[PDB]
Design a binder for this molecule. Structure first.
Ligand SMILES: Nc1nc2c(ncn2[C@@H]2O[C@H](COP(=O)(O)OP(=O)(O)OP(=O)(O)O)[C@@H](O)[C@H]2O)c(=O)[nH]1
Length: 285
C-alpha cells in the first residue's frame, strides 16, 4: 500500500496517479514521490515502480543507468521492483522494443508491465499488485546450486522448467496461514546477475546446494563466501554414496540432508519450509 514512483522527465507519476482518482480513498493505498533526514525514512517504507518512455530511448537507457543502482542498493531485502513502460497509446511511436525491455526486466528480477496512463491500463495494473499483496505477503529469494544433473529433479515441485534456456528463475508459493512466496534461483543466474547488479545476495536468504556422489563444494562455497555470511543454509543429497560422515565435514558450515527422486514429497516439503519458516521467525523485529 506504500508506493514510490521514479524515472526521468518526459512523462510519469503526475499523470499516473492523476488517474488514481479511481483508486484512492477495504484495501488501502498510499503514494509519494521520492525526490528531511527523518522524512528520508518513509522513502524506504515502500512495498516497491521505475518507469520510462517508450518514445524516448534516453528514458530507458537512463532506467538502465541513472535510476537503478539506488533502488537496488538501499532497498531492504523486502519490497520488489516493477518496471513500467508508459504511453503504449503511442505504440506507433515505440522506439523501444518490448522483449529486450522485458528481458532486461527479467535479468534484474523485476516485474514488467506496459501501460497507458490515459485510459484502460492503470487500474488493471494497480489491481494486479493489490491482488499479489493478499495473494501473498512478499517474496523470499533463495538460491540453489546449478550444477548439471540434480537441480531439475529438485525443482520439479514448483510447473517444470527449456524455459530459460540459460537461467531458471523459478517460483513456488505455499505456506501455513500467512501464505508467503519463495523464489528459487540457480547458480547460472547469480553470476549473470552480478554483471547487472553486483551483490544481489542482500536479497538472498536461504542457500541450497545439492549433490549426488562426487563433489568438492570448495569453489562454489568460497566464491559464495563473499556476499553471504549472513544467509541461511542447507546441503542436500540427490540421485558409493549416502555416507553422512563426510557430508557433515563440509556441512560443519551448515546443516545437511539426504534423499532421492520422489521420496522428496516430504524432504522437499521438509527442508524448504523448515528453513523458510525460520526466515519468518528467526530474524524479525
Ligand atoms: N501520450 C501520453 N502522454 C502521457 C501519458 N502519461 C503522461 N503523459 C504526458 O507526460 C507529460 C509530462 O510528464 P508528467 O505527466 O508531468 O510526468 P511526471 O510524473 O510529472 O514527471 P515529469 O516528466 O518530471 O513532469 C504530459 O504532457 C503528459 O501529457 C500517456 O499515457 N500517454
Amino acid at each position: 500500500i506504500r508506493l514510490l514512483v521514479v524515472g526521468s522527465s518526459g512523462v510519469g507519476k503526475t499523470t499516473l496517479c492523476d488517474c488514481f482518482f479511481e483508486s484512492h480513498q477495504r484495501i488501502s493505498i498510499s503514494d509519494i514521490v521520492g525526490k528531511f533526514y527523518a522524512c528520508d525514512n518513509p522513502y524506504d517504507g515502500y512495498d516497491a515502480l521505475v518507469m520510462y518512455d517508450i518514445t524516448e530511448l534516453k528514458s530507458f537507457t537512463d532506467l538502465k543507468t541513472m535510476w537503478l543502482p539506488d533502488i537496488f542498493l538501499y532497498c531492504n531485502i523486502d519490497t520488489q521492483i516493477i518496471i513500467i513502460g508508459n504511453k503504449k497509446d503511442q505504440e506507433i511511436d515505440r522506439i523501444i522494443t518490448r522483449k529486450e525491455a522485458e528481458q532486461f526486466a527479467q535479468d534484474r528480477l523485476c516485474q514488467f508491465y506496459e501501460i497507458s496512463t490515459k485510459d484502460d491500463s492503470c487500474q488493471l495494473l494497480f489491481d494486479c499488485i493489490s491482488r499479489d499483496f493478499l495473494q501473498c505477503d512478499i517474496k523470499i529469494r533463495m538460491l540453489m546450486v546449478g550444477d548439471q544433473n540434480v537441480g531439475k529433479t529438485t525443482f520439479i515441485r514448483k510447473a517444470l522448467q527449456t524455459g530459460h534456456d540459460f537461467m531458471n528463475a523459478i517460483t513456488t508459493r505455499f505456506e501455513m496461514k500467512i501464505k508467503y512466496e519463495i523464489i528459487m534461483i540457480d547458480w547460472g543466474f547469480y553470476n549473470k546477475l552480478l554483471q547487472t547488479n553486483p551483490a544481489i545476495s542482500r536479497t538472498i536468504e536461504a542457500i541450497l546446494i545439492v549433490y549426488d556422489i562426487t563433489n568438492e563444494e570448495s569453489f562454489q562455497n568460497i566464491h559464495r563466501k563473499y556476499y553471504p555470511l549472513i544467509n541461511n543454509k542447507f546441503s542436500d543429497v540427490a540421485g558409493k554414496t549416502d555416507l553422512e560422515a563426510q557430508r557433515k565435514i563440509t556441512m560443519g558450515d551448515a546443516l545437511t540432508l539426504a534423499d532421492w527422486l520422489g521420496y522428496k514429497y516430504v524432504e522437499m516439503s521438509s527442508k524448504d519450509t523448515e528453513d523458510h519458516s525460520s526466515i519468518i521467525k528467526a530474524l524479525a523485529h
